[PDB]
Every structure is written in C-alpha cells, then in structure tokens.
Enzyme design. Structure first.
Site, PDB file in Angstrom:
ATOM      1  N   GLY A 164      25.201  -9.112  29.741  1.00 47.82           N
ATOM      2  CA  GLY A 164      26.328  -9.138  29.269  1.00 47.82           C
ATOM      3  C   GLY A 164      27.371  -9.844  30.543  1.00 47.82           C
ATOM      4  N   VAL A 165      26.830  -8.958  31.434  1.00 45.18           N
ATOM      5  CA  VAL A 165      28.087  -9.535  32.698  1.00 45.18           C
ATOM      6  C   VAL A 165      27.281 -11.884  32.502  1.00 45.18           C
ATOM      7  CG1 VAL A 165      27.622  -7.911  34.081  1.00 45.18           C
ATOM      8  CG2 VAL A 165      25.579  -9.270  34.457  1.00 45.18           C
TER       9      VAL A 165
ATOM     10  N   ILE B  17      16.905  -8.537  26.440  1.00 47.65           N
ATOM     11  CA  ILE B  17      18.537  -8.662  25.875  1.00 47.65           C
ATOM     12  C   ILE B  17      19.378  -8.872  26.889  1.00 47.65           C
ATOM     13  CG2 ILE B  17      20.880  -7.144  25.667  1.00 47.65           C
ATOM     14  CD1 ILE B  17      18.954  -4.109  24.386  1.00 47.65           C
TER      15      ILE B  17
ATOM     16  N   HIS C  31      15.530  -6.504  32.523  1.00 44.14           N
ATOM     17  CA  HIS C  31      16.706  -6.536  30.936  1.00 44.14           C
ATOM     18  C   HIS C  31      16.464  -6.862  30.131  1.00 44.14           C
ATOM     19  CE1 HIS C  31      21.007  -5.467  31.355  1.00 44.14           C
ATOM     20  NE2 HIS C  31      21.152  -6.013  29.940  1.00 44.14           N
TER      21      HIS C  31
ATOM     22  N   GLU D  88      29.658 -14.571  32.976  1.00 48.33           N
ATOM     23  CA  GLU D  88      29.291 -15.830  33.879  1.00 48.33           C
ATOM     24  C   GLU D  88      29.207 -17.257  33.308  1.00 48.33           C
ATOM     25  OE1 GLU D  88      28.338 -17.623  37.379  1.00 48.33           O
ATOM     26  OE2 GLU D  88      29.181 -15.319  37.198  1.00 48.33           O
TER      27      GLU D  88
END
Ligand SMILES: [Cl-]
Ligand SMILES: [Cl-]
Ligand SMILES: [Cl-]
Ligand SMILES: [Cl-]
Ligand SMILES: [Cl-]
Ligand SMILES: [Cl-]
Lengths: 149, 147, 152, 151, 151, 152
Positions: E59-60, E56, E50, E64
């Site tokens: 985002g998830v 990067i 990723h 978290e």
C-alpha cells in the site's frame, strides 16, 4: 564427486552466499578439491567493480572455508543430510592469506584444501585457490563443528 | 581472445542479461566460439527451479544470440567501441532449436556459432551450445543491430 | 582533512558499490594513524537470504572486507586528503590478511564499528590492523596489508 | 475453471521468482487452448541490463512465458487443478521452432499469451501461438515441452 | 505532450530501479491533473517478501507511485518536458494525508494513478486523487510537496 | 511476554520477508499500549540503487511501512503473545494512513527508531500513531490503521 544437489544437502548456505559449485576430489581426513565457476552474471560484480569485474578476495576465502567445512563434515559423517542439519561449522580463525592473481568472470575458481590437523571437533585446513593450474590465492583456516541451535 | 572487459565494450547487454563471459575464437563473417560459466551464485536459479537448479534453455539461446551479435559487431565495424555504444540488438527469428542435456551449476557453457547469412544490420547464424565436448543444444536465429 | 565523513564522501573516495560497499560512515580519522568507521547491519540486505535461512548472521569475511575498505579510505586520504578526482584514479588492493579471529556473531540490528590503526606504511604499501566492534565489544580482529594501485 | 489468478499459477507451475512469467489466466479449454498474460513494468530486474536507457523485454523471455502458459494448460489437462501432485513436477524445454518477433515489448505493456495444443502425448506437449499487446501480435512461436516428476 | 512513455519518464524523474513506480503517462493537463499507470507483475522483487504465497502490492508503494505522478505533473507544469532542467530540481514531499485502501492490488493488475492539483502556492504543491484498477477506486490520498533546487 | 525481541523472533511473528521486513529489533513492548523498535539503515540495501543514484535517501513511504510493521508486532503479541504457530497463518493489511509529515531525510548510517502507541484497537483492527526517530530527533510522524487477517 559431488554436484550442486549434494552440496545443497550438506551446507546450509544459500544464494547469494553458497560459493561452491562442485566437488571433484575428496579424501576423508585428508584433502578436497572443489570449484566455483565465476561468471559476469553474478550480483557482486555490480559493485566490485563497475566496468572492472573482480571476484572479491574475501569471497575466495569464504569459498575455501566452505570447501574445508564440507571436507571436515563428510570425513566424520559422510554424506548425511539429516546430521548435516543438526550441526554447525563455525570458523574461528583465518591466517596466512595471500592474494597473487585477480579472479575474473570466465575463470574456474578451484579450491584445494588439506587437513593440517584435527582434534575432536576442532579442524584446521589449509591450501590454495587456483585458476588453470596457477595459485591465485592461499590461506589457512580453523573451524569448530558443534550442535545447531 | 576477448575477455569480459572487451565484451562490455561491444555488446550493450548488462547484468543480469549479459550471458557471455569470454570469446575464445573469432573469424569475421565466418564463426565464433565463446563461453559462459554457470554457477549456483546466479539469481535465475532461485526460481528455476527451487531445489533443482537448471540453467534456462531460453537463456542458452540468448547466449548464442549474444555470441553471434559479437561476431556481427566485429565483422561489421571491427572492434570499434564507440560505434557500438550507440546500438542495441533485437531478436528477429529463432528456429530449429533442440535441448539435449540440461545445463547446471558447475558447467562451462561453450557457444559455437557460424554465420549462415547476413545483409546490412540483419544477421542469421546457427550452431550449438556445448558442455565438456557434448552438444547440449542446437539453434538458428536472426537478429538485427539498430541505432 | 575532517575527521567525520558520510556516505556521500565515502562514495567519492572508494570505488566499491552495491552490493560490496560495506562502510556507511566515518566517525574518526587521524591521517597516517587511524580511522574509526561503521556499517549498519539490517535484515534488509540480500546477503541474509543465504546466510542463513531463518538465522541471519553477517558473513565474517564481509566483516574483514569492511575493515579493509575502512583502511583503504584511511590510506588514500592520508596521502591526498579528500581528493575525489585523484581517488578515482587509484584503487586500494589488499595483498595479505593475517591473524583474523571471529569472536562474536554479528546480526541484524548491530552497529558494526570498524577500528583500524596504521601498523606500517612506506609509499603505496599500507599495513593495517584492528578490530570490528558491536556495543564496545570486540566481535572480530584482523591484520591486512594493502597496495595503493593505479586503476588503469 | 477458465480463469485463474497468481495464487493458482503458483500452486501449479514450479517456476518461481525471477522466472515465473505468467501473471493471470483468462481462459483455457482442456487439451486445447489457453489465454494468459504477463504485465510488463519497469520495476523488473531484467531491465537493468536489457538495455540501459532502453528497456526492452527480452524476446527469449516472451517465449519462456508462452511455454509456461502451455505448461499450465498441460498440467491441468492431465491432472486437473491438483497442487499436491504439481509441487513435485518440473518442466523441461525440448524444442523451439518458427519463432518471430514483430514488435518490441516495453514497460507498460500487457503481454498476452495465446497457445493452442498442436499435439500432445503423455508428458510431451507441443503448443503453438502468439504473444499479443493491445490486440496486436508481437511474437509467434511453436514449442515442445515435457512435464517430469522431480528426482 | 499528452502521453509519455517510460523513455520520457526516465529523463524527467530521478527515480530508478527498484523505486521508479510509474510506467507510462496516458493523460496530462498542465496545472490541472494527470493520469498515468504502473503495471503490477509477479516478476517484481517486492513480492518475495510481501507476502510469500500471497503477492500483494504494498500500500505504501501505491502512495509512492501517486506521489511520483504528482511530481511529474508539477514539474512538467512548470517547465514542460525538459530533461536538462529536470536534473536541477527535487520534488520534496512534506506530508501525506487522508489515504484509504479499499481493494488490494495484485500481480496482473493495472494500477492507474489519478491525481489533480488541489493547491499551488509558490514552491508548494498540494495534490490529491486515487489509485484505480479496472475503473474501481483502489486507494485515495492527498499529498503536499515542495519544489526546490537539487544539491 | 518480554520487552526485547530480536530478528529471529520478529521473523517468527510478522509475515514480512526480504525485501519488505523493515524492523530489525524490538527494544520496548507494552501489550495493547506502545512499542519501541528500530531498523538499521545501510547503503547495502537494494532500494538505494534507485532512490537515488549518487544520493541515498531512505524512502519516506518505507518509513511508514516500518512504523506499521512495528505496530503489527505489537498487535500480534498483544493478541496471542509470542506464538509462532498462530502467527504463521496471518498477513497484515494497511487500511488507512494519516497525518504523515516528513521532517528529516533518513540516510545510510542512521538508526531509524519507531515509536508507536495504540490509539484504538478492537479484534484484528489496530490503529497506531507515533514518530520515527534518528538520534533523538523526530524524523517523521504518522498515524495508520491496519488489519490482521487469515491468509485464507
Ligand atoms: Cl579483492
Ligand atoms: Cl528449460
Ligand atoms: Cl561467517
Ligand atoms: Cl530481445
Ligand atoms: Cl499493504
Ligand atoms: Cl522519500
């Protein structure tokens, strides 16, 4: 003799499924002797088994398969990386597998395969896996070589 | 000899940082000879280096530090698993290390360490790392055992 | 003995752990007779990084392994039922593997269903045979003899 | 340039996961010095085994991170920022001297590398310096590395 | 306490590698807010995919980490630093809302979680806040969790 | 453009790689409208090592990630059809997530099915919403907006 670099150009297998570290002996159409070092620093030992590292028997077989395929390939085309990429070595059967001694970290898992019979692209190899001269495993396998994707 | 099972009972190191597979020789307060097999099936090779697997020189040193740690745990408390499980090891100093030959998959990395000096939990050792009888590296180091 | 078990139960019976526990759920279980279980195949498994780049194929030898683990669960519970305390003192060891045949490649997205039947069993010695299936189709078949051994 | 990010490091250094231990370069003078750093988090594989219940960033990896810092300074000092030339180069450790660890490095630490060139000729660079956390020195090291064309 | 290190976080959160996404707690006000962070380094497995050649932080995973921080806040507010009781509880998250990503997070960044209790009624905790890097708001989000008995 | 795509295809479209490619197969696809895809959940996934020991639960945030990737596949193919040369130059960035609800935990052995519909789209900006399903039941709900951009 072939080293990891050579192996990497013939076999498509990569981490963590490339189980042959070096080829020490090779007689075209006849036999092969290769080995894979077994160390604790391998991810498989995290689960096979905790506080009791035993190299999977199925992986010993996968190692013998890879050695046999390397044998079948080089016998036909020698050390040819370009052709290696255009071929697939498919294992059709495996039989007569027996496990005698557990392989553990610190062992030099040596593969001894010989060509039992071959016709066209169908190749049958057989032999043993050894550690310090003793047979830790044995098996027979049959592969078919074909054109890649 | 001391196999991996034993090693795990003395050294607190675990995957992917336990770099000693077997102990072939041990002599309290004197020397130790051990080894680690090098195979392609090790995660470190994915990044060191792609298409050119070379066992990291610093990990060879770590392997010698570990070999010396084993000799230290044993010279200190003999083979006592329960005293050991409460400690960890810290690197203090490393000096005079030279790399002569690159270690690669297929090699049997044999460690040779002798005690140069020691006091309490602080241990100083030095020696070499060998492959097939040849010296691939030399080093000296000092580690500390701690609760 | 129930006939359905989830990963929570498998973990209590089998000693295998990541990344070598290749059985996710047990759907049918007949003591001394058979077991039907399965392992989900997903791209998110480390094995695919190397088998193979750009062409993910689940290793045939691991299919066999999953079959052996399924058989091991069957062997153990056929004798002690669901007994975690005892299970933790036994380890199932396979001595032989015969008549293995790979018919169809298994890939991410596949539900690898293990079908094992007890061919013979005396004491701690169990002989099992069966198939691995995806969507009702046989993708592989094998025979294995295992030994119920003491862990220590 | 004096500042470089992970995108630039990747284009220069041959090291890859899980052996690329330099996250960012904050300053560097050609043939002279380089300041860089590596963030240390619990989410790193080495921590599973070093050690359970007590995450301590391995000392030998701090040395490794200092060497990679030197390598980046070495490469850019020879060929400037040239990815195409750098993609076929490798870096061999030659020697390591006078290293000293003073403070354990743990998750949450910003490991900052400070290397100075002590001598360099052709492909052989001898750098020396420290590893710092929160302005304090956690390690010292002197090392000689060699840049080589991959064959 | 006000500051908790990875050692303490390990005794409170059930999360382990590679899903423990909080490295240190710098601020903690019972029933009010929490400030903690996680370092972002290239040496993390997730960067392998990723994305290749463009690391990067997902985002998830920022959300978290924010959730994990909220959970620590909630737990410590109820029982303080109690590892023993910690093992008998679970912080089940039911909903996540109004999350916006403003600036990508990359290796070398210090991801600072800023969360505060928006509402607390019974076993239900509602928390909200932002993720920041060097004073800049990188992400924001609202979350709701339920405290329950571990089984 | 077909409506069934396998991992080999997904690999040629999405930029995601191990361990963040969380869609294994596409079962339904309608350009600019909806898509149905799924990811097999297995114990043999590294993420379970820490979430949580002795109690494997697929992280809820990873379920949203999967829904986003399915959406991404929809977006790419809607925009350029199955085109590997153009897709290879892109990445996908999350912009917003909304109304996510976690109703049922996902565990090893489950077949996580993603159901997404296009709420709005213009250029590289795609807004999708839907559910994650296991055996016909809604496991999670979510709405998210993502952007496709050149890796530069
Ligand atoms: Cl075995
Ligand atoms: Cl090196
Ligand atoms: Cl295979
Ligand atoms: Cl250390
Ligand atoms: Cl993202
Ligand atoms: Cl979750």
């Amino acid at each position: 003799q072939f080293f990891i670099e050579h192996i990497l150009q013939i076999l498509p297998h990569r981490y963590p499924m490339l189980l042959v570290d070096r080829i020490t002996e090779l007689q075209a159409n006849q036999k092969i002797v290769a080995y894979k070092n077994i160390t604790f620093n391998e991810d498989v030992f995290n689960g096979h088994f905790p506080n009791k590292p035993i190299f999977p028997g199925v992986l010993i077989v996968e190692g013998m398969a890879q050695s046999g395929g390397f044998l079948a390939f080089t016998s036909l085309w020698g050390f040819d990386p370009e052709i290696a990429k255009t071929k697939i070595v498919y294992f059709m059967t495996i039989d007569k597998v027996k496990f005698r001694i557990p392989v553990t970290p610190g062992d030099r898992l040596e593969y001894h395969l010989e060509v039992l019979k071959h016709k066209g692209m169908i190749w049958q190899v057989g032999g043993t896996a050894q550690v310090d001269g003793k047979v830790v495993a044995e098996a027979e396998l049959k592969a078919m070589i074909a054109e890649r994707e």
